[PDB]
Amino acid sequence: DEAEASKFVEEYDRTSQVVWNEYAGANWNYNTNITTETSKILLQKNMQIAQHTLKYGTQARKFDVNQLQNTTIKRIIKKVQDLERAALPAQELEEYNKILLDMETTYSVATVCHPQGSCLQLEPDLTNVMATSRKYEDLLWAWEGWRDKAGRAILQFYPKYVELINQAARLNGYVDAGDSWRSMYETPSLEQDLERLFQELQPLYLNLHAYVRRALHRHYGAQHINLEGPIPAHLLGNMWAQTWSNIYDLVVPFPSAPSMDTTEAMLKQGWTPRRMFKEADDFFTSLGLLPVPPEFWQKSMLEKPTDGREVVCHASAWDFYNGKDFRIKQCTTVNLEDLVVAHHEMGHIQYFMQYKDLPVALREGANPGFHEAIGDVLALSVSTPKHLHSLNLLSSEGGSDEHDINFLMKMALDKIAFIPFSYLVDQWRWRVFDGSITKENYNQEWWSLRLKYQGLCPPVPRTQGDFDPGAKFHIPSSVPYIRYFVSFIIQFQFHEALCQAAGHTGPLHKCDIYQSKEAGQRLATAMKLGFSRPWPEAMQLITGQPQMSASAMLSYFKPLLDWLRTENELHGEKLGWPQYNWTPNS
Ligand SMILES: *[C@@H]1O[C@H](CO[C@@H]2O[C@@H](C)[C@@H](O)[C@@H](O)[C@@H]2O)[C@@H](O[C@@H]2O[C@H](CO)[C@@H](O[C@@H]3O[C@H](CO[C@H]4O[C@H](CO)[C@@H](O)[C@H](O)[C@@H]4O[C@@H]4O[C@H](CO)[C@@H](O)[C@H](O)[C@H]4NC(C)=O)[C@@H](O)[C@H](O[C@H]4O[C@H](CO)[C@@H](O)[C@H](O)[C@@H]4O[C@@H]4O[C@H](CO)[C@@H](O)[C@H](O)[C@H]4NC(C)=O)[C@@H]3O)[C@H](O)[C@H]2NC(C)=O)[C@H](O)[C@H]1NC(C)=O
Ligand SMILES: CS(=O)(=O)N[C@@H](CCCCN)C(=O)NC[C@H](CC1(C(=O)N[C@@H](Cc2ccc(O)cc2)C(=O)O)CCCC1)C(=O)O
Ligand SMILES: *[C@@H]1O[C@H](CO)[C@@H](O[C@@H]2O[C@H](CO)[C@@H](O)[C@H](O)[C@H]2NC(C)=O)[C@H](O)[C@H]1NC(C)=O
Ligand SMILES: [Cl-]
Ligand SMILES: [Cl-]
Ligand SMILES: [Zn+2]
Structure with missing residues (x-):
């Protein structure tokens, strides 16, 4: 009935x-x-x-x-x-929950120590080294040490994790956990669609890679950088080489067009975590979107407590499933990167509020990539030199072609560099889950993909017992990652569409949608659908067409693509890594 x-x-x-x-x-x-x-x-x-x-x-x-x-x-x-893990028999379910807890705990307590010296946590100690050191051996100590202490310690758990999560997937009618994860997109053509998007971004990524490789050759020396090979994975300013913007100082296109130190500006001007979130709240309501409720400000944890509690510091956004109580938990630091993270997390909160009246089973994003994209779309406008100047965090940088290319390079070091990394993670996991990668070759296959997609090599040859995927949070925490690849593509589509709705003309990367009610209305109609309809319906509400497309991202970066091609040509760069077998000699 x-x-x-x-x-x-x-x-x-x-x-x-x-x-x-x-x-x-x-x-x-x-x-x-x-x-x-x-x-x-x-x-x-x-x-x-x-x-x-x-x-x-x-x-x-x-x-x-x-x-x-x-x-x-x-x-x-x-x-x-779909019962997910609750389909497991009792013994296996207890074992699975315990393995997940053990992996997460192992990752969270791992430290890297100097003998008769200090022991460094990943955050902030080791990430600060990766961001700021310009000494090959100091970077190598942090990069290798983190893999030695976190990655190697996860390996003991991972085969049994794979067995149990696959068993649960099969008990819910999937062939393995990767099949189950991909099904969240309800798109039979998903793998081909994602591959096509990846291929559309190859010209930009290969040109950025070659330009950065040349800059690293200048700094770290010819004996340590092969101009026809992959880049050593510890030189990009980030523990996973997933975003490269911390080495902007080494690659700035126009050093004669300097940029303000935005962290020092925020500190000098007395920015606080609460101010950062109030600024994000203000951007959302400027679009006519929803303010966070008063309860959010009372109950959220927006900086690390000083009362003796120990906390999980990673940025996160929380739906309490009563239509009223939404919270962010973040050990916020006062810098521009965390201002962007604040906007990211506030986009999750906005989506929670927009779909709060649906049945809880439909209280998700159109697909997981949509949930990740909302905050980043607003952050693209926040990041414009125009908007940053209005926050007193940059001197006026408008007009100048040099500042313009410098800005696009800053943006590309995160947004473009991340495309192959975010593609890689679940290409590897899907092949672990479907059994085509075994525990005998977990790590070798990881590095084959790090090479194939990102053009990176490990600075130290890997050995038996290494499990470098375990040194990346989302692997031991069993969080799917392709959502972030999808998000980084479609957020540019959304930016383009909202900029058009707001009446912007001229280069897409100059658009700032602050206070556009037309832009807000597009996003709200889509978010209110939650997970009630196939995601192409929300795509059409925002953009006027139903497909994922890299065209908007390419349009945003077109002036940089042109600049990179000219620069790489006059230096005679060989794009890619035909000497893909190269690895460091010392
Ligand atoms: C197939 O079935 C589905 C599902 O049916 C639903 O679920 C099943 C299991 C049974 O329980 C059904 O009885 C039940 O209807 C059908 O889809 C539904 O179709 C109805 C149409 O009959 C839609 O009605 C609309 O619902 C929204 C949202 O309702 C939630 O939130 C409201 C605000 O808080 C609240 O009032 C509701 O009680 C409900 O509350 C939430 O319920 C969920 C569970 O569903 C629960 O998890 C939440 O916790 C709970 N939240 C709270 C706070 O209690 C409602 O807002 C709509 O009202 C607008 O639309 C009317 C029709 O146009 C209009 O007369 C109203 O005045 C109001 O109009 C708007 O007003 C503004 C300003 O005034 C104006 O600007 C707008 O233009 C105007 N809108 C206009 C003109 O259109 C309305 O009641 C359901 O949303 C819908 N549900 C889903 C999930 O899709 C489906 O129809 C069936 N298919 C077929 C072919 O029969
Ligand atoms: C705890 S919950 O499950 O209930 N709520 C989820 C969100 C709603 C899910 C809806 N179903 C949640 O809070 N998740 C935390 C996660 C944290 C971040 C994360 O890991 N980012 C990845 C990828 C990335 C993303 C953006 C970027 O610029 C660079 C990298 C990483 O750092 O590698 C760290 C800061 C940015 C997000 C998040 O917000 O998405
Ligand atoms: C941190 O967690 C502990 C453990 O739950 C909390 O301690 C409890 O506090 C309530 C009073 O509010 C007591 O009724 C419980 O008996 C306490 N349990 C223990 C083991 O001490 C503590 O309140 C929490 N701290 C904060 C700041 O939330
Ligand atoms: Cl790695
Ligand atoms: Cl996903
Ligand atoms: Zn997110």
Whole structure:
């Protein structure tokens, strides 16, 4: 009966709101106050949500979706039929939860020590070294040490993790965990579509790579940089070489056109974490989008506590599944990078608020990439030299062609450099999950892809027992990553569309959509759909067409592509890494 299915969905919604809200609370209380007691309560709520998922998922599977007429009810019931880890038998579920906790803990407590010296945590100690050191051996100590202490220590857990997460996927009707993850996009052509996008960005990435490689050759010396080979992976300013903007000082196109030190400016002018989030809130409401509720300001953790609590510091945004309580947890630091992260996280909060009236089963983004993109779209406008000057964080940089190319290079060092990294992570994981990479070659296959996609090599030859993927957070925390590749493509599509809605003309990279109500209306209509419709509908609401496309990103960076090609040609660069077998001699 249509009526029995409707009743079921209503009962699922009521009970899920209660159970998910209790789990969100317990998880928040652990994350903002790590103790034995909060771990204990969290463990109990984890089991309560499993029992709820098992109960309602079992019921949902008794419905023949084929016989359901109402498409919304059909959609919800089909989704509740996927129990995820709660499909595992009791022993395997306990084992899986424990392996996940052990991997996450191992990663979070790993430190790198000098003998009879200080021990450095990843954040901020080791990331600061990677960002600021310009000494090959000091960078190497941090890069190798982090892999030695975090990566190698995850390896013992990962094969059993793969076995259990695949078993859960098969018990929910998928062939492996990678299949299950890809299904979140509801797009049978996903793999080919993503490959096509990656290929469209190759001219830009290869030209950026070759230009940066030449700059590294200048600084680190001819004996350590092969101008026809891959770049050593510890020289890009970031522990994973996923974004390169911390080496802007080594690659600036026009050193004669200097830029203000934005961190020093923010500190001198008394910026605080709360001010950073108020600025993000203001951008959202300038578009006519929703302000965060008063409760957000009361309950959020917007900087590291000084009351003796120990906390999880990573930036994060939290839906408590009651339509009222939304929070950010971030150990915010006062700099421009974290101002952008604040906008990223506030985009997650905005999406939570926009879809709060849907059934909790449809309270997700159109696809996971959409959820990641919203905040970054606003941050693109924030990052314009125009807007940064209005915050008193830059001197006037408009007009000047040199400042213009310098700005596009700054943007490309993050946005373009990240495209191959964000593609790589789940290309590797999909092949682990489908069994075509075994524990015998986890690491070799990781580096084959680091080479193939990013054009990087490890500065020190890897050895047996190395497990460098484990040194990247999302691997031991089992967080899918292709969402970030999707996000970095489509956020430029959204920027282009909103800039057009706002009446912007001229180069896309000069657009600042601040206070555009037309831009806000486009985003709001799409966000309010949550996960109720196939994501091409939200794509069309924003952009006027239904596809993912790299064209907007290419248009944004067109002046840099032209500059890079001219620069690389006059130095005779050989794009790519035909000497792909090269690795450092010392
Ligand atoms: C197939 O079934 C689906 C699902 O049906 C729903 O679920 C099943 C299981 C059963 O329970 C059904 O009884 C139930 O309807 C059908 O899809 C639904 O279709 C109805 C149309 O009949 C749509 O009605 C709209 O719903 C919105 C949102 O409603 C939530 O939020 C409201 C605001 O907080 C609140 O009032 C509601 O009670 C509801 O509350 C939330 O409910 C969810 C669970 O669903 C729960 O998780 C949340 O916790 C809970 N939140 C809170 C806070 O309680 C409602 O806002 C709409 O009102 C507008 O539209 C009317 C029609 O146009 C109009 O008369 C109203 O005045 C109002 O109009 C707008 O007003 C503004 C300003 O005044 C104006 O600017 C706008 O232009 C104007 N809109 C206009 C003119 O269009 C309305 O009631 C459901 O949204 C929809 N649900 C989903 C999920 O899609 C589907 O129709 C079925 N298909 C077929 C072919 O039959
Ligand atoms: C805890 S939750 O699950 O309930 N809520 C999720 C978000 C809603 C999911 C909806 N279903 C959440 O808070 N997640 C945390 C995660 C943290 C960040 C993260 O890891 N970023 C990746 C990739 C990246 C992204 C942007 C960028 O510029 C550079 C890199 C990384 O750093 O490698 C670190 C700061 C930027 C995001 C996030 O916000 O997406
Ligand atoms: C951090 O967590 C501990 C453990 O839950 C909290 O301590 C509890 O505090 C309440 C009073 O509010 C007592 O009723 C419990 O008995 C306490 N338990 C223990 C083990 O001490 C503590 O309040 C939390 N701190 C913060 C700042 O939230
Ligand atoms: Cl690595
Ligand atoms: Cl994803
Ligand atoms: Zn995010």
